[PDB]
Amino acid sequence: GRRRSVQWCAVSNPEATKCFQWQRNMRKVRGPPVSCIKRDSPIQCIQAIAENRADAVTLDGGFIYEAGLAPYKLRPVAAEVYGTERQPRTHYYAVAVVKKGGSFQLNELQGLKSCHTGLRRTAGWNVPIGTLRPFLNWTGPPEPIEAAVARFFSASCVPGADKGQFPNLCRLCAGTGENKCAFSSQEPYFSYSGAFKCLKDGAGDVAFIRESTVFEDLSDEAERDEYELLCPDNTRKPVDKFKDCHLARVPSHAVVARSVNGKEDAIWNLLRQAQEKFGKDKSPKFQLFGSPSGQKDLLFKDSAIGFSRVPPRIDSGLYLGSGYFTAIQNLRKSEEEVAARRARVVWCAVGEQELRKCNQWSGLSEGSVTCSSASTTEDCIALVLKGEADAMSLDGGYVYTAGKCGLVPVLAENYKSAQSSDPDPNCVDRPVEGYLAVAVVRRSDTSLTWNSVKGKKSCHTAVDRTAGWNIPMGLLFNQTGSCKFDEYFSQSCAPGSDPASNLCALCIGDEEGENKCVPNSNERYYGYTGAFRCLAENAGDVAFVKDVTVLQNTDGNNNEAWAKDLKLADFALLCLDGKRKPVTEARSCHLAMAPNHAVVSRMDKVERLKQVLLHQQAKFGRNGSDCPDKFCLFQSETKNLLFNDNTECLARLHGKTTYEKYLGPQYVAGITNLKKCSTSPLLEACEFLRK
Ligand SMILES: *[C@@H]1O[C@H](CO[C@@H]2O[C@@H](C)[C@@H](O)[C@@H](O)[C@@H]2O)[C@@H](O)[C@H](O)[C@H]1NC(C)=O
Ligand SMILES: [Fe+3]
Ligand SMILES: [Fe+3]
């Protein structure tokens, strides 16, 4: 009775005239309120937003990019949905439409005339120009890419272009006066329908719009027949074959809002009702997805079917997709700065200590490796998704999440074998054998068995790692089907959980006592070395780690203060049969076999990644040319920074090149079951981007 409104930002008069009826019917039916704001452009609307004079606006992919840049930092909150109620989709295709009768393919457009939807729009600009780049002889900056297309076509209509500098880009626009080639409806050849009309009138030879335009604007089925599409493989096809002939599959326009004090429920509360009441044939009083007779797409795309909420972890970069997002950024770069970026491998580092090591490695790589960093593994996977980082080594737990996200395993960390190989010259081709997940306890604790571990104090590598969480919690879950994971044990140190939770009561933080329960190396109780440490310092009663962990931190194998004096004979293993065994019989006393930490990446980087890695280990490997004279890839002494200190080499996958194949049927069924108790913001973001 004081959240007075969700201030919509309008970009024209008709828009505002559309947004007011909107408001008139909203309160008429007692729906949530919405007041209108006026401006003259998408850019003006982005700015009104960033500075609280409006709350939301639906933009095209091209302006989502721009709205997401600092100093604006808007976020897409709701996606338009297209198709029909039975096959809704939150994506569309950018096609290149032509008239039947000619015989020019997509590689033969130089000197033709073109119609575009507007400067910087997905289908009318970003997509067609990026596809065409090979043909433009562009020199890269500072010469604007606009200049290169202006020499490309004889004439065009590119609403918003600078008439000034690029008269050619404005030649075919139909506006009258200063309206000629403006970025609004005053310009008849603006947007999907203006671009399509520029083609129809015989003003341009190709139109760069969306797959529906031809169907929306040509009523009668036979009129459409006068049209064809230019496919990327230099073939023409019927207009309805868009699926097999499009220049790109793109994210749907979306409503953006502020990242910080955005008013996200108000917006969604409003949209949700509006769709219901005034959606696709619901009210002859007012139509949310339709325009008065002289207009097109006021406020929203005509013939959209509703909205789809965008999960909170999503930002512009993630919304656009690595392909699209990077393609946009590549419009402002030379072909040389772009090829240099394709050749280079950017590593994602989890914590300062991994960054430091990565920096070290960076300088010795003769320009092949660079560093990016984040404070959680999840944040690094997000960075690889935005194309902003390319790779990292991951626990099988995280390869699940990464694979759900469409990433792929490329090389695996190889460890000593079932005692085959000696100081193995064929370690890159020696198939991986899994590591053993164990439950360790102090020998003194005579009474501690698997059977009575529950309710005790536990130490975990981190939430969602194989040895440290999936295996122990999975086995336990399987006995009571309870999802109340913070009740399995009285207290714990399970990094990456809520620090206000039981699950974090034993974490001790970094050397100063900050960073408690964070899922990176600043928490002294993190990972393998840290969950072991949690045991040896008597914080916990059981540590869920791997068997070589104990070997490595006892018998003067780790001189660090806390470790110095630990003897193997003091720790024992819990077997699933009730028994306890010495650490050396882990092979007959373990919880499960865990898939090897694997390095993951985007599909586009696989083959270049493979080569940099092979090359780099040949030199900084276990038995490598510069280790230890200068740098050792695989050593950080007990720290397990970037890779596990016991990696012999990075070996080949043998065909298992998908998270499913790599991890195994059984592993994947299990996590999948656990995940049902709770998913992360990240898995929610990726389900959304995958439909
Ligand atoms: C682009 O430059 C083309 C000619 O140059 C060379 O061969 C062609 C096939 C390209 O691969 C190019 O990169 C090579 O330098 C010209 O034929 C063409 O007319 C160029 N420029 C424009 C916009 O016309
Ligand atoms: Fe668009
Ligand atoms: Fe692991």
Curated annotation (Swiss-Prot):
Glycosylation sites: N137, N478, N623
Outcome of swapping K73A: Almost no protease activity
Family of the protein in this entry: Belongs to the transferrin family.
Annotated ranges, domain Transferrin-like: 6-333, 345-676
Gene3D superfamilies, per database record: Periplasmic binding protein-like II
Gene (UniProt): LTF
Binding-site residues, hydrogencarbonate 1: T117, R121, A123, G124
This protein's name: Lactotransferrin
Residues the record marks as site: Important for iron binding: R210
Region Involved in glycosaminoglycan binding: start-end pairs: 27-32
Effect noted on mutating D60S: Impairs iron binding and changes domain closure
E.C. number(s) listed in UniProt: 3.4.21.-
